[PDB]
Structure formats: C-alpha cells, structure tokens
Enzyme design. Structure first.
Site, PDB file in Angstrom:
ATOM      1  N   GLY B  44      -6.733  -4.812   4.730  1.00 34.48           N
ATOM      2  CA  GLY B  44      -6.864  -6.210   4.354  1.00 34.48           C
ATOM      3  C   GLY B  44      -6.898  -7.055   5.606  1.00 34.48           C
ATOM      4  O   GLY B  44      -7.869  -6.992   6.359  1.00 34.48           O
ATOM      5  N   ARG B 192     -18.965  -0.367   4.559  1.00 33.45           N
ATOM      6  CA  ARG B 192     -17.735   0.408   4.670  1.00 33.45           C
ATOM      7  C   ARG B 192     -18.099   1.879   4.505  1.00 33.45           C
ATOM      8  O   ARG B 192     -17.564   2.742   5.202  1.00 33.45           O
ATOM      9  CB  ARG B 192     -16.739   0.000   3.577  1.00 33.45           C
ATOM     10  CG  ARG B 192     -16.221  -1.429   3.682  1.00 33.45           C
ATOM     11  CD  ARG B 192     -15.151  -1.588   4.761  1.00 33.45           C
ATOM     12  NE  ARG B 192     -14.420  -2.836   4.549  1.00 33.45           N
ATOM     13  CZ  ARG B 192     -13.189  -3.086   4.987  1.00 33.45           C
ATOM     14  NH1 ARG B 192     -12.513  -2.180   5.685  1.00 33.45           N
ATOM     15  NH2 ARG B 192     -12.616  -4.244   4.691  1.00 33.45           N
ATOM     16  N   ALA B 257      -5.027  -3.090  -2.810  1.00 35.20           N
ATOM     17  CA  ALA B 257      -4.352  -3.778  -3.903  1.00 35.20           C
ATOM     18  C   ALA B 257      -3.099  -4.521  -3.452  1.00 35.20           C
ATOM     19  O   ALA B 257      -2.594  -5.385  -4.172  1.00 35.20           O
ATOM     20  CB  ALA B 257      -3.994  -2.773  -4.984  1.00 35.20           C
ATOM     21  N   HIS B 258      -2.601  -4.181  -2.264  1.00 38.24           N
ATOM     22  CA  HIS B 258      -1.400  -4.806  -1.709  1.00 38.24           C
ATOM     23  C   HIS B 258      -1.620  -6.288  -1.382  1.00 38.24           C
ATOM     24  O   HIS B 258      -0.665  -7.028  -1.156  1.00 38.24           O
ATOM     25  CB  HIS B 258      -0.983  -4.095  -0.414  1.00 38.24           C
ATOM     26  CG  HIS B 258      -1.887  -4.397   0.738  1.00 38.24           C
ATOM     27  ND1 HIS B 258      -3.144  -3.846   0.860  1.00 38.24           N
ATOM     28  CD2 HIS B 258      -1.763  -5.278   1.759  1.00 38.24           C
ATOM     29  CE1 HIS B 258      -3.759  -4.378   1.902  1.00 38.24           C
ATOM     30  NE2 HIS B 258      -2.942  -5.250   2.465  1.00 38.24           N
ATOM     31  N   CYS B 401      -0.598  14.430  14.687  1.00 30.28           N
ATOM     32  CA  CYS B 401       0.005  15.749  14.520  1.00 30.28           C
ATOM     33  C   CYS B 401       1.452  15.586  14.118  1.00 30.28           C
ATOM     34  O   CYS B 401       2.273  15.164  14.922  1.00 30.28           O
ATOM     35  CB  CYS B 401      -0.053  16.554  15.821  1.00 30.28           C
ATOM     36  SG  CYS B 401       0.712  18.211  15.700  1.00 30.28           S
TER      37      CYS B 401
HETATM   38  N1  LIG Z   1      -0.087   5.704   1.848  1.00 31.64           N
HETATM   39  C1  LIG Z   1      -0.342   5.502   3.127  1.00 31.64           C
HETATM   40  O1  LIG Z   1       0.110   6.420   4.043  1.00 31.64           O
HETATM   41  C2  LIG Z   1      -1.107   4.319   3.635  1.00 31.64           C
HETATM   42  C3  LIG Z   1      -1.374   4.146   5.015  1.00 31.64           C
HETATM   43  C4  LIG Z   1      -2.102   3.035   5.477  1.00 31.64           C
HETATM   44  C5  LIG Z   1      -2.560   2.100   4.546  1.00 31.64           C
HETATM   45  N2  LIG Z   1      -2.290   2.278   3.192  1.00 31.64           N
HETATM   46  C6  LIG Z   1      -2.753   1.314   2.179  1.00 31.64           C
HETATM   47  O2  LIG Z   1      -4.025   1.742   1.738  1.00 31.64           O
HETATM   48  C7  LIG Z   1      -4.791   0.614   1.335  1.00 31.64           C
HETATM   49  C8  LIG Z   1      -6.134   0.552   2.044  1.00 31.64           C
HETATM   50  O3  LIG Z   1      -5.999   0.470   3.446  1.00 31.64           O
HETATM   51  P1  LIG Z   1      -7.334   0.338   4.316  1.00 31.64           P
HETATM   52  O4  LIG Z   1      -6.990   0.256   5.762  1.00 31.64           O
HETATM   53  O5  LIG Z   1      -8.369   1.317   3.936  1.00 31.64           O
HETATM   54  O6  LIG Z   1      -7.740  -1.144   3.829  1.00 31.64           O
HETATM   55  P2  LIG Z   1      -9.096  -1.935   4.081  1.00 31.64           P
HETATM   56  O7  LIG Z   1      -8.824  -3.388   3.757  1.00 31.64           O
HETATM   57  O8  LIG Z   1      -9.578  -1.605   5.427  1.00 31.64           O
HETATM   58  O9  LIG Z   1     -10.128  -1.291   3.049  1.00 31.64           O
HETATM   59  C9  LIG Z   1      -9.990  -1.502   1.672  1.00 31.64           C
HETATM   60  C10 LIG Z   1     -11.306  -1.124   1.006  1.00 31.64           C
HETATM   61  O10 LIG Z   1     -11.181  -1.463  -0.364  1.00 31.64           O
HETATM   62  C11 LIG Z   1     -12.490  -1.783  -0.761  1.00 31.64           C
HETATM   63  N3  LIG Z   1     -12.482  -2.324  -2.132  1.00 31.64           N
HETATM   64  C12 LIG Z   1     -11.966  -3.523  -2.568  1.00 31.64           C
HETATM   65  N4  LIG Z   1     -12.177  -3.639  -3.885  1.00 31.64           N
HETATM   66  C13 LIG Z   1     -12.818  -2.534  -4.314  1.00 31.64           C
HETATM   67  C14 LIG Z   1     -13.303  -2.108  -5.565  1.00 31.64           C
HETATM   68  N5  LIG Z   1     -13.145  -2.863  -6.653  1.00 31.64           N
HETATM   69  N6  LIG Z   1     -13.945  -0.873  -5.665  1.00 31.64           N
HETATM   70  C15 LIG Z   1     -14.119  -0.072  -4.533  1.00 31.64           C
HETATM   71  N7  LIG Z   1     -13.648  -0.488  -3.295  1.00 31.64           N
HETATM   72  C16 LIG Z   1     -13.023  -1.699  -3.199  1.00 31.64           C
HETATM   73  C17 LIG Z   1     -12.983  -2.689   0.325  1.00 31.64           C
HETATM   74  O11 LIG Z   1     -14.365  -2.957   0.270  1.00 31.64           O
HETATM   75  C18 LIG Z   1     -12.504  -1.925   1.546  1.00 31.64           C
HETATM   76  O12 LIG Z   1     -13.484  -1.079   2.136  1.00 31.64           O
HETATM   77  C19 LIG Z   1      -3.907  -0.610   1.586  1.00 31.64           C
HETATM   78  O13 LIG Z   1      -3.265  -1.022   0.386  1.00 31.64           O
HETATM   79  C20 LIG Z   1      -2.957  -0.127   2.643  1.00 31.64           C
HETATM   80  O14 LIG Z   1      -1.793  -0.912   2.780  1.00 31.64           O
HETATM   81  C21 LIG Z   1      -1.579   3.365   2.727  1.00 31.64           C
END
Ligand SMILES: NC(=O)c1ccc[n+]([C@@H]2O[C@H](COP(=O)([O-])OP(=O)(O)OC[C@H]3O[C@@H](n4cnc5c(N)ncnc54)[C@H](O)[C@@H]3O)[C@@H](O)[C@H]2O)c1
Ligand SMILES: NC(=O)c1ccc[n+]([C@@H]2O[C@H](COP(=O)([O-])OP(=O)(O)OC[C@H]3O[C@@H](n4cnc5c(N)ncnc54)[C@H](O)[C@@H]3O)[C@@H](O)[C@H]2O)c1
Lengths: 544, 546
Positions: B44, B192, B257-258, B401
C-alpha cells in the site's frame, strides 16, 4: 513490610544493580506506597510487580545481575536476561502495552485474571516513586501559574475545591497552601485523609461540610493558607456546595477516574458497600461509577459557568463524563495546555533524585548544591526553601526539583562528583515521572491540544525510551495507559545512577542530555517558538 | 531514480553510517520498490521517508553522522541527533505510532494530509527491504508446511487460488511453484503482473479465465509446476471460479486489505476510475472497497465449505469482512498459528543479509558459507540451493535465509570474518522483516491464538527494540500497524552491520543472540513446550525458573 536497604553495604554485585533493588523496595515502603501489601503504589492498581512470585524473582535476578548484563521485565514479570555492555541499562521494562484495538480495561482485566497483566501507571512499575513529593512541585507550579493568570500571582484569599486524597492527589492540599490559598478537598475514605494528615500534606480534617466551610471562610477572611480534608463523596458534596451558593474560586479533581472499577466510588455507597458492589457485580459498579463521574463533572461545569476557574488535573475524568453523554465535558482545559506546557518547551519536568544512603544529609547537600550551580535563579531557590520547610521525607530521602535542558546534565554531573569525593554519603538515583517534556503522548493530558494537532502521535514517547537506552541510562521503561488509563497514553521513563565513577560521568552527560533534549525537539517540531529557540540556544540538532 | 552506492567508495564518515545510506536508497531502487516516485516501497503506502524533503535531510544527516552519534527518525522524518556510544545504534526509528484510542486509518489520514504522518509498514520505513525475496522463504515455508499437512508433502498435482501480485504478494506464484504446485494469482493491475513476470516470480499471464483454467488443468495433470497471473478483480473473479465448479485445492489471499483506501480496488472500476474515486471521495471509496472485500471473503469461505484448504495470509482481510457483517469471517486460520509458529519456537524467522558491494559474487560466496557452517542441515542446503537457482537479484544482491537461535550468531560472525579478510568485497548488512519469532504483537497474524491467550500483549515487541538497542545493533526501529494495518499490530525491527571490525564481532555476538533470544523467551512464557526445550538446551535465561 518491605523497605529499601540503607547504608553502603551491597546485596548486589555492583552499585548500579543495588540501586534498582533499593528503588524497587522503596516503591513498596509503608511510608511510601498506598497499599504495598498488594504491591500497589498509587493511581488505582498501579503496581511495582505482577505478583509476589514475580516480585521475589526480580530481587533474585537483580542480586546476581552482572555489570554488563540487562534484565528484561514484561508487565512486572522478569522474563529474560541478556549480555549487553556496561553502558547499557541494567534493566529494560515494558509494562501494560496492548495492541491498540485491544487497549481497553475490559481486555486488560481479562488478561489480568489469567495472570498475564499488571498496570504500571507511570512510576509504580518503573521503580522511581518517591511518595506524595513526586507530583508536589508539578501541582504547585500548576496552581502558581493559575494564580498569576487570574489572581494577581497568589491564591491568598481564594478558595479551591477538589477531590481525591490518594498517593498523588494527596499533594493537592499542600500545593494550594504553598500558594497561600485555602482549599477543601473531598475524600471518601477517612484512612486516606489520615495518611495525608500524618505526612504533613494536609492541615485539618472534618466530616461536616458546615465545619469545613466555616474554617475555609475564616481562613479566606484572615487571608491565611489552610488545607481542609472533607470526608464524603465528591459526586455528592460538590453539588451540595453548588446548590448552597458557596463562593468557589478554583475547581479541579484528582480522584482515580482513569479506572472506573477501582478509582471512583459510586455515590450512595459506603466503602464497605462499594467493596461488595465491586466484587459481586463489577459491571454494575462500573456503570454506576461512570454515572457518578458524569454528575461530578456536571458540577464542575456549573462552577465554571458560575465564574470559577476550572481545569482537568490529568485523571481523564472529562472523558468519562463525555462517554456518558455529557457533550460539553471538555468545556474546561487540561492543566498542561493551560498552565504547564511552556515549562516543557524549556525542557523542564518532574526531574528528581533519591539518596540510596537513606541519610537526609545527602538531600540537604544536593539542595545547597542547586544554589551553587544556579546562583541567579531566584525561583529555584524559593522552591528549594519551601521544599525543605514543608516536605517530610518518605522512605529513602528524596527531592523533586524541576530542572530544564542543560540544568539536568549540570546537576547530574555535579551530584556524581560529590558521590566520588564523599560529600554525598552513597550513590544517588536520578529519575523523573513519565510525565515529562519529551517522554509522553496523551491527548487528554500532556499532549492535549498541541498547536499543530499532533496530540495522538506516539512516536516521540517511543523515541524517548530508545535514545535513552542508547545514551546509557540505568533502567529504561515504556508504559501504556499511565495517568489517564487504558488506550489513552504511551510514555517512557528513565533512571540513571550517579555512583561517582568515571563511567557514570560519561553516561550521565549523555542521557541527561538526550532525555530532556527529546522534549525540546518534540515541541520545536510542533511549532512552539520557545522550544525552537532553546534548540538554537543550546545547540540541539533539529534536522529540518 | 534512486539506488544504493556501490563499491568501496564512501560518502559517509564510516561504513556503518554508509550502510544506512545505502539500504535507505536501495529501498527506493526502481528494481526494488513498487512505486519509488512517491517513496513507496511496498504494502500500500509503506514509505521510506515522510516526503522528499525528509528524504534528502536524512541523507545529509547520514553523511555527517559520527561513529558515536545517533540520528532520530520519527515517521520518516529526521527530528533529532544525540551523542551516544560507538556500540549504540546509529539510527533509532519510531514510525506510525498512535495513541491507542486514535490508532485507526481515519486519524492516520488526517495527520498524513497535515504532513504529520507516514506509514512505515515493516521494512519500508526501516530500510531493510530487498524486493520480493524478503518474504519468499516465509511464503514457501507456509505452503511447504501446508503441503506436508494436507497433501503428502508436496503441492504437485494441486491448484492454488490467490490474489495480489504486489511487492510481497508477487512471491506467492514462485512459492507455490517451488513446492511443485500450480497456482492462479488474480491481479487487477497489469503493470503489477508484468513486474512479477520480469523479476521471474511468475511464469505466465492472461486476461482470459478460460485460458488460465486450461493452462492449470494441463499442468496439474502433467504433474508440472506452473504459476499463472490472471488479470482481473478477485472480488468478481473468485465468485466466477466458485460458481462454475472449478476444483480448487488451496485458497488464500494477499491483496492490501490492511489499507482500504489504497490497497484494494472496488469491483467494477478501472484503475483510472478508482484513482478518481479515491482522490475525490475517499470515504465513499473505503465503503466500496470494504463492500468488495466482504464479497471476496465470502468466496473464500465457500471454497473452504467446498473442501479446499483456506487460510489468511496476513493482510487482515478476515477482519475487514468481519467488520462488514460476515460473522464467520474467521472460519479459516491465519498462517502463523496454522503453519509457521513452530519455526518461531526455534527462534527462526526471515533473517536476511545484503552486500553493500553491489556484486552478486559476495552473495554467492555467502551461499557457500552457509553450507560450510551447517554441513549436516539438509533442509538449509536445499533452501539456499533453490534461492540461488530461482531468485533473480533486485538492487543490492541480497539473500533471504531463515536461521534460528544460535545459527544467526554463527552466520553473522562468519560473514564478518570474510569481510575482514577480503573474501567479501565490502561490508554486508544483516537484518530481517519485523515479522519474526520475538519482535511482534499481532492478534490477527503473528500472535493469533497464542496458547495462553496472550495475543494482544505488546510488551515483547517493545522489549525487542529495547534489548537490541542495548545489545548494539546498527539501527533499531519500532513501528505500528505493519502488515495488518492501523490498530492491529506493534512490532520492532533490527539491522546490524558486519564491517569486518572487532567492534562488530562483539556487537554482532550480542545482538544476534538477544534478537532471536527474545523470540524464545516469549513463546516459552506463553507455554510452548519446544520453546521451553530450546531455552534449556541453549541456556537461555527464564528468570521465573528455579
Ligand atoms: N504475511 C506476511 O508475511 C506479509 C509480509 C509482507 C506484507 N504482507 C501483507 O500482504 C499484503 C500485500 O503486500 P504487497 O507488498 O504485495 O502490497 P502492494 O500494495 O504492493 O500490492 C497489493 C496488490 O493488490 C492488488 N489488488 C488490489 N485490489 C485487488 C483486487 N480486487 N484483485 C486483485 N488484485 C488487487 C494491487 O493492484 C497490488 O498489486 C499487505 O496487506 C501486506 O501488509 C504480508
Ligand atoms: N496530573 C498528574 O501530574 C498526575 C500524576 C500522577 C497521578 N495522576 C492521576 O491522579 C489520579 C489520582 O492518583 P492517586 O495516586 O492519588 O490515586 P489513588 O488511587 O491513590 O487515590 C485515589 C483517591 O480517590 C478517592 N476517591 C474515589 N472516589 C471518590 C469520590 N467519589 N469522592 C472523593 N474521593 C474519591 C479514593 O478514596 C482515593 O483516596 C489518578 O487518575 C492518577 O492517574 C495525575
């Protein structure tokens, strides 16, 4: 009965670690704490340790802690110990911190019953409480400033109305008295009143309003200072004085409104009845307590509309009334934006120190030192003379003395020098309350109505703790909810020991600079000119 | 365009401060960040600095910062600098922290437009992002453990459905593929998709659902791994796949979604239309986005009820649905309590390192180093082999790693040795994500369903930051809201520099012990038996024990 060890004999491996152990114990000294048998120091259930098992584990860890080791404390429970460096803090504390969405009393209590929580308040869980003296100057300055703003620079011939005579609230009476005023303080627990009378923080006590008002008028007339403790429930008494047409010049409050379950007694209940209400029907207790505070605040507002100067003295009581539907609960300001903030912009705060020797001679020595280091500061000398005459020591002899940026370092280094030469009989702990110029974020108190609206920014409080650990403090703490309750504040504490060594000279110069420095940059960033000026004046780096 | 300096030439007064400058820039490298023109790194609006002016002031401060000084960064803005010690961190950062009662997106945006806020996510504001590789092993391990649990130990022959091909979500396709599986990842923005394809994190792309299903079926049969990026809106696409009876083995999601305003595109709008909707009517936008995320989650619940293994992959989507009325939004678990928690009990986590040299040779050398140090560990060798084979470098060559307690100290001291002798051409930065065994509190993710119910306790994250500062890390950070959004998490980051000096050996030994050490004592305190075992085995002090 726990009390800090006295003298020069150590129980630990080094003076720095013994300092922690003594201050922890001092926090629970019967002369110091409000209810130490239950580990309670002040402000509701502000405790020194999670439970007794935890308490004893900390003592053991402290005695075996090495000069280059760091003990980790999680909500009053020693949870780890790692090797660091001689300049790193001996202890690191994080008390009552909860993820924002869960930062409320309901979840705190749920964790508490499971033995997973403790409320550290500010100085309770970080071992730097010195009895009613800790807030004394804070309360004194607040009233002194209010005096200069509305009564010609004195409270002579004025009557103050307030409530709450607990650990910190008990300092209100002496504070008004030192400003030459008359004050009536309502307290529902006679035992609390006696504690204040015994420790010289309040002149008289009475159960009858008639007698209280007669004494107040008589003293106001003769233009003499006088503190009167009135036994009763404020939610009720204030309305009685209000509907009697009594002339009240100033109105505030310091009941433990930040904790609806423990800190406020519902109108119509004796202490015994309240205790049963609290134990048997906790949820009923809270609903009724909240209704009483809403009523208590309506009375304060009525007084303000009647002409008296009214202000919130940091117990979040306005929020409680607000939550009950009192839309104008915030019609009166918090003491910080109204009277104290300017002091913060100069790096001033409830800076303080305690003599591990236990000999008041050391405090007297530091008192004279103050006059030597700052010979031109009349107000400082006036404050020290009042302190020496009206303050009676509790537990380890201590001193509350608001010093600003620069003044702190200068005093700290001087103190360490006297410890080294022996003029001071033992090392002295240098600390402060968490309420300080750059250690706390609290929209309803310390950071209420920042000019730029950054009230809720909590980054600085976190930065305060981080930099002081890097600078070389003796023990750093990060708490949540101190003063105003769950969800309303984040703040840091810092304590550094002056054991007379060269190491201490190094660390003290660093941390006594960073701690208040943090306060200057936070207010400079908000746009407070005096703070921006202090930065240029004493070379405090402000990047942009 | 910005990128980290390369070579042995210094712009700062020392290598430690130079390391900060280079990781800060590496965070905004076109090769690394998602949208660096706006200081956006990933997730985001996770940024590297408040605004451009703040960015340049930080650079300037970093170039003059002395060996015993400490810069203070407040939500991506340099606000102070104080003298500390050679062993104390060079930079201390506090990003996005809000008093609890105000810890929501509404107050964040209000402060942000006043130029008083910045979202640091986890590694965006703490300068330790290394492209999609950062989360790669975490995601691989998540699917790997899931495979062992439900599909005999391999995803070969299974089809995974997910969404989100951003900086971090872009690692999903490769993660499934490395597990021998087939995956269809829905992404609404083709730029993307191309990014993932070019960086080799995804095999193919298509805007045809029909074509996508045909490629997957063909591969699932032939038993070959294959990742397919499907152009579309998950809110709509997943219900189409559901209503047509597609056989889907695993379902998760990783859109942003965050952050309802920036991270999710409401169904029915083109990117251009959603941009206007977002600028002009932000409140309406959020309402529509939440409406779409609810529909999205309803589909995920349907697949589960249909027999597919479903899980939340840390973007707080379940919460957004719950808040909308989906009472059973939490019917599927978060990946941590379901697949990763055991690893944290070993003090393992997304440990990582980057070569300030800019020469991939240094990384290949560290890959060999790992094997030398842990010659018995087949799992470790296999992972590192896969990474070096499937991971294409981004910005400064870096390596993800996972190493547990003890292993981190060993690898860190060894790396430092190689920097000293010259085998490694320049100092290397040792860090990690803020998601780790003992650095975070997040009820909807890392600390979801702690066995003792201590989910919401945030003291440990604070202690982590505090201990590492005392231990002697190069830069420590404490953020709020990373990964799951405002009000849902508190966490700390830690970076240490191996510059070949003896000062580093001592600092490294101290901090690479405390950081993972905290993870052990936190899980042991919660009652996790393996955690208690590791504590005994390694002599980690648990004060309450007699
Ligand atoms: N679990 C983990 O270890 C971990 C680690 C890092 C980030 N995250 C979380 O993962 C999520 C994504 O991070 P990111 O860096 O990829 O974010 P980002 O903002 O870079 O990418 C999000 C993607 O969602 C897409 N998107 C939005 N609405 C959509 C829809 N309706 N259909 C399909 N795609 C859609 C956007 O176009 C974008 O490419 C965040 O919520 C982040 O906080 C989780
Ligand atoms: N502004 C500051 O600088 C500052 C500093 C420290 C503490 N505080 C706050 O001040 C408050 C009091 O702290 P404390 O340590 O004295 O608390 P405490 O718990 O020790 O005492 C509270 C007092 O309130 C009394 N009380 C409760 N209901 C009452 C009623 N209806 N009428 C009259 N008295 C009633 C109790 O009997 C008790 O004596 C707290 O909210 C605390 O957080 C403020």
């Amino acid at each position: 009965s726990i009390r800090a060890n006295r003298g020069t004999e150590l129980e630990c491996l080094g003076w720095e670690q013994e300092a922690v152990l003594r201050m922890l114990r001092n926090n629970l000294d019967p002369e110091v704490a409000e209810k130490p048998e239950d580990l309670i120091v002040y402000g509701g259930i502000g405790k020194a340790a999670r439970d007794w098992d935890a308490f004893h584990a900390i003592e053991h860890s402290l005695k075996t802690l090495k000069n280059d080791e760091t003990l980790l404390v999680q909500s009053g429970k020693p949870v780890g110990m790692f090797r660091t460096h001689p300049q790193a803090p001996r202890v690191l504390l994080a008390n009552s911190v909860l993820v924002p969405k869960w930062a409320d009393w309901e979840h705190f209590h749920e964790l508490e019953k499971k033995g997973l929580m403790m409320y550290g308040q500010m100085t309770a869980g970080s071992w730097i409480y010195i009895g009613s003296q800790g807030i004394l100057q804070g309360t004194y300055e607040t009233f002194a400033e209010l005096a200069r703003q509305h009564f010609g620079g004195s409270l002579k011939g004025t009557l103050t109305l307030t409530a709450g005579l607990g650990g910190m609230g008990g300092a209100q009476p002496l504070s008004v008295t030192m400003n030459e005023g008359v004050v009536i303080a309502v307290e529902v627990d006679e035992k609390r009143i006696d504690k204040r009378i015994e420790t010289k923080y309040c002149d008289r006590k009475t159960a009858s309003i008639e007698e209280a008002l007669a004494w107040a008028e008589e003293a106001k007339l003769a233009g003499k200072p006088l503190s009167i403790a009135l036994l009763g429930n404020a939610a009720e008494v204030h309305h009685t004085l209000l509907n009697r047409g009594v002339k009240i010049d100033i109105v505030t409050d310091q009941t433990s409104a930040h904790d609806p379950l423990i800190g406020y007694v519902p109108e119509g209940y004796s202490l015994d009845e309240a205790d049963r209400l609290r134990q048997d029907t906790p949820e009923l207790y809270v609903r009724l307590a909240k209704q009483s505070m809403k009523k208590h605040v309506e009375a304060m507002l009525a007084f303000q509309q009647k002409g008296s100067i009214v202000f919130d003295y940091g117990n979040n009581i306005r929020q409680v009334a607000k939550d009950e539907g009192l839309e104008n609960a915030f019609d009166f300001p918090g003491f910080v934006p109204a009277y104290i903030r300017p002091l913060f912009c100069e790096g001033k705060g409830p800076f303080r120190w305690a003599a591990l020797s236990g000999d008041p001679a050391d405090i007297y020595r530091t008192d004279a030192l103050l006059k030597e280091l700052f010979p031109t500061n009349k107000a400082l000398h006036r404050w020290i003379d009042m302190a020496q005459e009206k303050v009676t020591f509790q537990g380890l002899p201590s001193r509350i003395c608001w010093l600003g940026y620069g003044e702190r370092k200068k005093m700290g280094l001087a103190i360490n020098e006297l410890v080294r030469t022996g003029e001071l009989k033992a090392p002295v702990v240098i600390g402060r309350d968490h309420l300080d110029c750059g250690s706390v974020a609290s929209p309803n108190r310390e950071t209420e109505a920042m000019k730029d609206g950054s009230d809720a920014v909590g980054d600085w409080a976190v930065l305060n703790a981080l930099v002081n650990t890097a600078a070389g403090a003796s023990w750093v703490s990060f708490h949540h909810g101190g003063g105003v309750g769950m969800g309303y504040s984040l703040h840091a504490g810092m304590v550094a020991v002056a054991d007379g060594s060269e190491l201490a000279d190094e660390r003290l110069a660093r941390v006594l600079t960073s701690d208040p420095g943090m306060g200057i940059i936070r207010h400079a960033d908000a746009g407070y000119e005096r703070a921006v000026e202090v930065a240029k004046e004493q070379d405090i780096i402000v990047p942009m």
